[PDB]
Amino acid sequence: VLMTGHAWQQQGMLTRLGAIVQRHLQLQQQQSDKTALTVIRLGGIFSRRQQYQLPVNVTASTLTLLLQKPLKLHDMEVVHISFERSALEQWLSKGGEIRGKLNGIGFAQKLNLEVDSAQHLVVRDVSLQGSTLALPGSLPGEIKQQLEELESDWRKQHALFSEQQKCLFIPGDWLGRIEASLQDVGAQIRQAQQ
Amino acid sequence: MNVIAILNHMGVYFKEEPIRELHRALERLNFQIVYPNDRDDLLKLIENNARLCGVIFDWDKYNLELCEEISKMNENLPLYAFANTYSTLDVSLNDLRLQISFFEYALGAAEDIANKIKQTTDEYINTILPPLTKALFKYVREGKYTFCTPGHMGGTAFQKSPVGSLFYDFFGPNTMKSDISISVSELGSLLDHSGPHKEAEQYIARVFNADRSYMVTNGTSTANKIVGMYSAPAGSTILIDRNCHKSLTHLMMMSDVTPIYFRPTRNAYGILGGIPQSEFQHATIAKRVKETPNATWPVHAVITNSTYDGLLYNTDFIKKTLDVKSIHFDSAWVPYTNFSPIYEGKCGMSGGRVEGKVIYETQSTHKLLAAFSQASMIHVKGDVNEETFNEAYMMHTTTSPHYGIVASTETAAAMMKGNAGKRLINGSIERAIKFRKEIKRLRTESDGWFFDVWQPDHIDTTECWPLRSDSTWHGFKNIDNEHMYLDPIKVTLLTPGMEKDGTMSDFGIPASIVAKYLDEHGIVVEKTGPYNLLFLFSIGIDKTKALSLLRALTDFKRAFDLNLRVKNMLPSLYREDPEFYENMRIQELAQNIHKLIVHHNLPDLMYRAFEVLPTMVMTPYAAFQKELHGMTEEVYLDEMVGRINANMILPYPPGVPLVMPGEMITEESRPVLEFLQMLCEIGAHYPGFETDIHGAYRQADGRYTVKVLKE
Amino acid sequence: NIDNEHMYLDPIKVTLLTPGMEKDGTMSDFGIPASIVAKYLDEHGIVVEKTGPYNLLFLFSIGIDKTKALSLLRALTDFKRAFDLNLRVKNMLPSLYREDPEFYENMRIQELAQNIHKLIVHHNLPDLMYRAFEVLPTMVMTPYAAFQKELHGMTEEVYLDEMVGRINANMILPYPPGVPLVMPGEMITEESRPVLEFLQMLCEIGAHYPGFETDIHGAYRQADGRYTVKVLKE
């Protein structure tokens, strides 16, 4: 775990990429009035008005959802709420209560989410305030400048491994897991720049 | 609805003169005026007369004796109480639902009072009626849309033909104008479930204690087939009950599933008990799945509660022990397990929502209620995929339903709501218990034999009599305590002929002769056969039709003790064969049939046949595919050993299936074939009592044949 | 190219053709759609059986006496008088005015009849409708197999602009006309290109004026305007 976590800065770039995503989501929620979040009604006659998320537009399991007016949930501020895809389809089809974490950290706490007449998602708090949720669309200049600095660090760490791997004293079975760990970090940093 | 009551007389003139002035004003708007006597007279004009909507009485005379007894019956009944100067309310009149309309004794203002009574009566009509029925009555008097379906359009096409005018004058103008399709905007559509139809389903499920109830417009037999098309995919396993209906047989022949049949309890008289508690255990469910090839975990269970005779089960133990996420209760005979406190925790709709399970019930509407034919309901209690269950409803229901049946289906749910509707359930129970006590009273005091009611020795209580293990009236060997109940309104008359130990007697009269005797007066027996008689004491049977049944029973003892002739007693049976039934009396026919039952041994060949289960080779769905190609043959009755049948044997008596379509009779199910061969001999000597089996066809020699599959 | 002695005409099925198209299959400058006339007949109680582009249909069975036949002609002559004199919508169609009194305020009967006729020529309705019905979509599996996937819970909905190559689950029944478009179990590929264009054309012509919304049995209406149909999961 140490050789595939902090050796060539595997996890070291993961805790640094979160600061770029946190700064990127701060600028996307400011201009969230351009692209809202329209929920479509799934086919079939049901007792309760069921809802269905976007089809091929979103495929992630732990996707994030932005919001316009921020609220004070659990005695703290929040700028983005992430819901689980395996748990969103169950609540929107069978009812009950939904559980979602705040700011991508902590446990999945319970929220007062309901359905809106304009096909949206209104988040209620302790003061009965409305907040329409939204999703980030498909790159600012400030985020791109900070992202290229972190992406260049991955090429520098990968260049060191592609030069000293000829050590005879190093077993061959260890090289099969180090290369697989470096490609996992590089495949994640190339997703936010899409 | 145009009866106005005027109670008491003050004796003065300034109060009786406005009564006479109002008497001449209410008759101009079609209203019947009645004048009861004392306080007990007005109470008899509400329970016996349901067309009353106006009570006029002095407020300063009976302010507490009338505002309490009337509120216990009809709460929304308007009260035209006339107050005075020194009039006030009472502290004991706050928790009572009433409608008091105050007026004065002003002379000459009787015309304005008549307009207020008509408007108040219209408010009572627009309140007790559901919004679906309200839209149907208003569309006839105002809605006059042209170019619509059907083609008659309120009976217009019938007025152009001489033969058509006879069919239009039979019903009425309002009858033909009420049959409209879904081509109306202010009434919505049934398949769309919007508008008046959306609020109609919420009004039935709320009163009957349910989440959402549908209105099947194709009878109960169709509602049972829709449930099977949900919790039984193409290749699953269901837990259908053995005592199933003819509609449930075709359900197993349309879905490629592997059903598992239970073994309910039974006695010697033919009254089937219920499924034991050991069949609901987890060690019993997985026992029959591993034995039967091609069977997975059961996902659906069909439980007949109650049965055809009326025996409630114990839903408090099934919803906890039986591990089935889709438990079905065939409540096609008890649509009243809610409006009485002696039915709590006895049905699927009593209680709450079971975590991880759902309750499906197909309660019949045109059986023991008040609605047109082809009407049923589907009660859903749970959080399942209702959209999938609704797809099977549109495949059997046409796009243009009949609103005349829908308006009556919801009416049955509105006639029972409130204290005015609850008196019909409790009133039918009181009339049933009273009829049960009249049998035991006319049994000991009589001189000779008399009918007996299948009831415990103690019937003083007013509740469901449980089937304990230390009793001898039920006769069920090894029965579970607090599992089987008794329906008070299902009086089962046990005719003499058998003992209390299960053997036979020497003097007795079968129930088949008594069944045809009641038809001469206009009484149709629901179930008959060995030595039992089933009747239906629902809300349709009032005190007139209930007391007339006892009088016909006393006439049978008189005609049998005096030894009368068949021609001078049963004219319908004499017309079937006047030559054979010439010199025959009522005592000679009753004694000859009783000896045939003991000789052929009916209780032994019936208790052992329906107990064991024949070897099921293939699924019932595979038997229907062979008939579609044309590979169905028939053999003799003594040659069907080892063959796969194609029909469901439903012998009368009793009334339960014997061999399911797709089973084989081998060496294990030997008594099963013996029951069919016994009925072919006992029902051939005397005409009228022929063998009636839904499957055995009559030939020209007497031997019956069944339909099997080609080898 | 129609076969002789094969197609017959029903005398009682009177099909009224409104002026709007030519005899060669093209369009014209002056034209009145049949959807506007259908709303005027409903005011007097006449329910139109079939309506859409420039055609009508009425049922003259044995129950239609001489009163209902003569009353239909009187309502048609009143539409010409109200259109030639250029009247208002509020003083002619009270049911349509109650749907949106703000938009249908200063609008007359001649302004609405000309704005809708220009949308049919611009979006080209007769050409996109004739080519979307001849080319049948590619049927992948049988309609019975498409219902088996819905019982297990493998159904989803995609947008109208993102559905090329997916198997539908419902039956598209657009009004007008009244015939099915895609059967439950077919796939829209490159061969059935005009088939998808017919659905996208009705979403734009039936979204500017209230009362003339797009009616397709299978396309649910949303708040953004883009209709979505139910398909099967991959």
Ligand SMILES: *Cc1c(COP(=O)(O)O)cnc(C)c1O
């Ligand atoms: C009588 C009965 C039926 C048939 O009822 P219909 O509404 O006439 O179809 C179906 N199931 C059971 C259990 C019945 O007793």
